[PDB]
């Protein structure tokens, strides 16, 4: 129908940016229209948002300046827009100290109508932003190296005691520490790395090996033991990590002797710096002044709390307490409850006024969901979710994904927020914020019918007459199954008095495609057909995937607006194969309503998965046809020639008068005495009445002159008194290839013909 498929503009393929969603934007103060696209983070492009313009019959893109810059993997980008500015939300990962779990929420930035920063928001530590009274307006870890002494001066009983001590210590530390690994070294005469950090990953093997080591005996070369621990462990070649803390536990008996290395220089050496030194004394023979001072040198600077004389089994309380971690409750395990850590605020967004925004919190409270009504200028928000009266209700509402999609509805003199919960029960639902007083909560108003159809994943209010009050609400079920994943869309009519929803129609895609995904993307495209009524577009990105060549696939369906509501069938179907080669998932994002070609006519953008397309909108022409007969009536038994004057006119103001019909040609034909078995009159020239081709001149009027002759043969007097019917049918012959100007198109909802009656003089007293 109205969209010019023959002249698309496409972002360069394979080059930057790799489009994910596209939307048209316009600054109300300057009337510039840009095309905002969002791309995932890549080495070429760091930015998540780009503004593109039409230059040299292509779409060139330049990144926007002050938007958040994602780091690492792609975790989500969301860009909505209204006449109050552009909102961009990025998902981020954060790790708190000594936390064995991560946080996943959004950092957002609000920009003005002209793409200048206005607000920044981080949604970590949500507790300090929340304001439960806010009025809702409705109009590496640690490594521990052990230095076991079995170097003579140690009886089998004391050695066995030491082995039990070390084994119990290892087990205890593995229980109270998660990311704490171990290494060991026996240094009796020789030095022998009994086990290494890589083996520490298998706890059972290391524990079994601890009991399986045998005394080596000989002489106590403790300083050499330290130097060996530093030349073999803590070194990244054997598995150590530079970031992790470093501890040591020295089970020496104090009888150092025959040490090839100097103790004092080894202990204080720069390499030793940065590693703790816990010293345990073995044997009763540690009561000499020299041995005591040796221990004191070995142990950390605050000798108390590090130096010891007996194997007390809780002497290592300090690390056992300092290194304690916290675990967020996960699948099948106990832990800290999931309240807001994985809230993913900003998953869906919506701009309400100059300050306030609406955000989706799909992951809040064990994936129950919700939404945050954030006030950007005051930096205070209010969380809104479904009420739970008992534990059963709370556990029943989990994993509903409320806040997956958010929208707003304009009633006569009020507002109403709604949300999508595609996983609700198991078929989906749409909620509405039923403010009752101080408390406002989401209560379900619409429910899907099929499991896994993801009802409520897409919302799309439509104000057909553009009066400021929503008249319909489109709700999509992209994965609906009949033979494959066809999709299905539901149109709901909002009562003008109660605000209730009543099903009106169920839109389905073109028959013959079992893998369409009809309804995955939906948008109100403003007014395209120049009729002052809003038109809508639905997207079916999987249409034609794999079948036949499969070079391109996807579809977009244009539905027009009527005073009654949406149409019954689509007025256009744009197939990706006819648009350009290589388009994949054509129709997973759409926008419109803003002029980007330079005429006064709103245009449209359809974003594939990696490219964006832009289509002009053609001018819709409405032809008024009149004719003057001569003589005004048919005299009884007339035999003269009838003179005919036929004049068309452009009753449509969609085009300047001094452009006529462009390169479109008017093709009209005449039918004489329609409906009569034998025609009373006839045309004087077959050429002048069949396939008559004319070129519209400058202006809004065209005219012609024709002649009619009496039909041959005996008079068919049977129905003389009835008015004679003359019919005119017309079309447009629009050129073939790409054109500089979008050629006009006849209106699809006005009959392309007219019938004029010529009375026949009566035989009564009064002829007419």
């Amino acid at each position: 129908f109205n969209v010019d498929v023959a002249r698309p503009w496409l972002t360069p393929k394979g080059g930057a940016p790799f489009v994910l969603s596209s939307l048209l934007h316009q600054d109300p103060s300057t009337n510039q229209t840009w095309l905002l696209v969002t791309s995932p983070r890549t080495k070429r492009t760091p930015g998540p948002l780009h503004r593109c313009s039409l230059v040299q019959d292509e779409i060139l893109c330049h990144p926007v300046e002050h938007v958040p810059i994602p780091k690492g993997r792609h975790r989500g980008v969301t860009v909505v827009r209204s006449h109050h500015g552009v909102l961009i939300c990025i998902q981020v990962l954060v790790r708190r100290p000594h936390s064995l779990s991560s946080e996943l929420t959004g950092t957002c930035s609000l920009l003005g109508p002209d793409l200048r920063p206005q607000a920044q928001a981080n949604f970590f530590d949500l507790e300090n932003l929340l304001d439960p009274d806010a009025r809702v307006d409705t109009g590496a870890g640690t490594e521990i190296a052990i230095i076991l002494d079995g170097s003579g001066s140690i009886d089998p009983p004391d050695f066995q005691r030491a082995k039990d001590f070390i084994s119990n210590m290892m087990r205890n530390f593995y229980e109270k520490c998660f990311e704490c690994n171990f290494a060991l070294v026996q240094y009796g005469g020789v030095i022998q790395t009994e086990f290494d950090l890589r083996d520490s990953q298998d706890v059972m093997a290391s524990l079994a090996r601890v009991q399986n080591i045998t005394q080596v005996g000989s002489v106590t070369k403790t300083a050499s033991a330290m130097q060996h621990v530093l030349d073999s462990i803590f070194t990244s070649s054997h598995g150590s990590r530079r970031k992790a803390s470093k501890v040591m536990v020295v089970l020496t008996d104090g009888g150092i002797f025959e040490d090839p290395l100097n103790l004092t220089t080894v202990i204080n050496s720069p390499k030793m710096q940065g590693v703790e030194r816990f010293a345990i004394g073995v044997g009763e023979e540690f009561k000499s002044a020299r041995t005591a001072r040796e221990l004191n040198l070995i142990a950390s600077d605050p000798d108390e709390t590090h130096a010891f004389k007996v194997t007390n089994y809780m002497a290592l309380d300090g690390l056992l307490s300092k290194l304690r971690y916290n675990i967020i409750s996960m699948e099948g395990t106990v832990g800290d409850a999931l309240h807001y850590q994985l809230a993913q605020i900003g998953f869906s967004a919506q701009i309400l006024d100059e300050r306030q925004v609406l955000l989706g919190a799909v992951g809040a409270f064990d994936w129950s969901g919700g939404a945050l009504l954030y006030d950007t200028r005051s930096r205070r928000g209010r969380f809104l979710n479904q009420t739970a009266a008992a534990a059963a209700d709370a556990e029943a509402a989990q994993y509903s994904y409320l806040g997956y999609a958010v929208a707003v509805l304009h009633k006569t003199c009020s507002l109403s927020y709604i949300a999508g919960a595609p996983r609700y029960k198991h078929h989906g639902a749409v909620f509405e914020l039923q403010k009752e007083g101080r408390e406002a909560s989401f209560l379900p108003v619409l429910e899907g019918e099929q499991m896994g159809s993801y009802f409520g994943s897409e919302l799309c209010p439509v104000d057909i007459d553009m009066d400021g009050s929503t008249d319909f609400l489109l709700v999509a079920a992209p994965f609906y199954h009949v033979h494959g994943e066809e999709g299905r869309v539901y149109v709901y009519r909002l009562s003008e008095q109660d605000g209730s929803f009543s099903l009106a129609r169920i839109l389905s895609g073109h028959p013959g495609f079992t893998n369409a995904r009809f309804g995955f993307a939906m948008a109100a495209m403003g007014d395209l057909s120049q009729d002052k009524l809003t038109d809508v577009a639905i997207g079916a990105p999987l249409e034609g995937f794999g079948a036949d060549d499969g070079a391109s696939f996807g579809s977009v369906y244009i539905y027009n607006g009527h005073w009654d509501g949406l149409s019954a069938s689509p007025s256009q179907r744009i197939r990706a194969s006819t648009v350009a080669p290589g388009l994949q998932y054509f129709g997973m994002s759409m926008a419109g309503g803003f002029d980007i070609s330079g005429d006064g006519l709103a245009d449209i953008t359809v974003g594939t998965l990696g490219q964006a397309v832009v289509f002009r909108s053609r001018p819709v022409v409405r032809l008024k046809v009149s004719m003057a007969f001569t003589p005004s009536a048919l005299p009884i038994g007339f035999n003269g020639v009838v003179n005919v004057r036929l004049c068309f006119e452009i009753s449509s103001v969609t085009t300047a008068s001094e452009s006529g019909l462009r390169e479109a040609l008017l093709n009209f034909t005449l039918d004489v005495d329609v409906g009569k078995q034998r025609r009373r009159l006839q045309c004087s020239d077959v050429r002048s009445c069949l396939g008559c081709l004319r070129e519209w001149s400058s202006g809004s009027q065209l005219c012609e002159d024709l002649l009619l002759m009496p039909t041959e043969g005996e008079l068919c007097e049977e129905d003389c008194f009835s008015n004679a019917s003359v019919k005119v049918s017309y079309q447009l012959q629009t050129p073939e290839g790409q054109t500089d100007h979008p050629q006009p198109i006849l209106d699809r909802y006005t009959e392309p013909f007219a019938i004029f009656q010529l009375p026949y003089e009566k035989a009564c007293k009064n002829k007419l």
Partner: antibody, heavy 121, light 116 residues
């Protein structure tokens, strides 16, 4: 009535750039295309240069003048400009702006008076 | 690349009150398959003046052009402009031009000269 005027002849040194002008009157400027064409002396004929739509500022260029020409439209003053970059002695010729026919197709329905460009040291 | 034009002859020796015939031919077809109009234009230039539009589509004259000019030129690949009776004002050069596809190209021109 539709008519176009230009700045007139110019003399520039080799390597400089000239910004010709084509003021338009008698019609809505943000509507109709402006086409440029150069008639090289010595009987070399004519060759179409480029195109620009004042409403959207979009352009399209013949490959031969892709980096040589650069068209722009000043909707406020209703004046169209072409910039010739890194001129040489060869570029000396007479250049014309144009106005497409409203109905049908005729790239140059109206022409400007003429403007001659001479590059010499 | 581009469509080539073979506008010939380079010049005609003519006398006032005689017929004329230019012959411009294109390397490709101009007949637009939808509007069925051949996309070719004719221009006229006199010495020291900018050219003028004579015939926009293959056979359609512009307002103000005297009737003695006829576009003829059917087929879509070969075209002929015929001047009925040459006159002193008609002395000049005529160029044919492609209109269907980019880049737009001209025919080189054909100049008239009075015989003597």
């Amino acid at each position: 009535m539709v008519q176009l005027q230009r700045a007139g002849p110019t003399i520039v040194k080799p390597g400089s750039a000239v910004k010709l002008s084509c003021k338009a009157t008698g019609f809505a400027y943000e509507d109709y295309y402006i086409f440029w064409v150069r008639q090289r002396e010595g009987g070399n004929g004519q060759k179409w240069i480029g195109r620009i739509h004042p409403g959207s500022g979009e352009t399209k260029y013949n490959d031969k003048f892709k980096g040589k020409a650069t068209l722009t439209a000043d909707t406020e003053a209703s004046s169209a400009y072409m910039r010739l970059t890194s001129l040489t002695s060869e570029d000396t010729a007479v250049w014309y702006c144009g106005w497409e026919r409203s109905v049908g197709r005729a790239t140059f329905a109206y022409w400007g008076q003429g403007t001659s460009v001479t590059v010499s040291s | 690349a581009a469509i080539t034009f073979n506008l010939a002859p380079e010049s005609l020796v003519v006398t006032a009150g005689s017929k004329v015939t230019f012959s411009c031919k294109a390397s490709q077809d101009f007949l637009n398959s939808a509007t069925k109009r051949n996309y070719l234009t004719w221009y006229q230039q006199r010495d020291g003046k900018p050219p003028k539009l004579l015939i926009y589509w293959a056979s359609a004259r512009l307002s103000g052009v005297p009737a003695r000019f006829t576009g003829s030129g059917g087929g879509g690949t070969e075209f002929t402009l015929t001047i009925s009776s040459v006159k002193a004002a008609d002395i000049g050069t005529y160029y044919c031009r492609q209109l269907r596809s980019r880049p737009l190209t001209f025919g080189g021109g054909t100049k008239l000269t009075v015989k003597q």
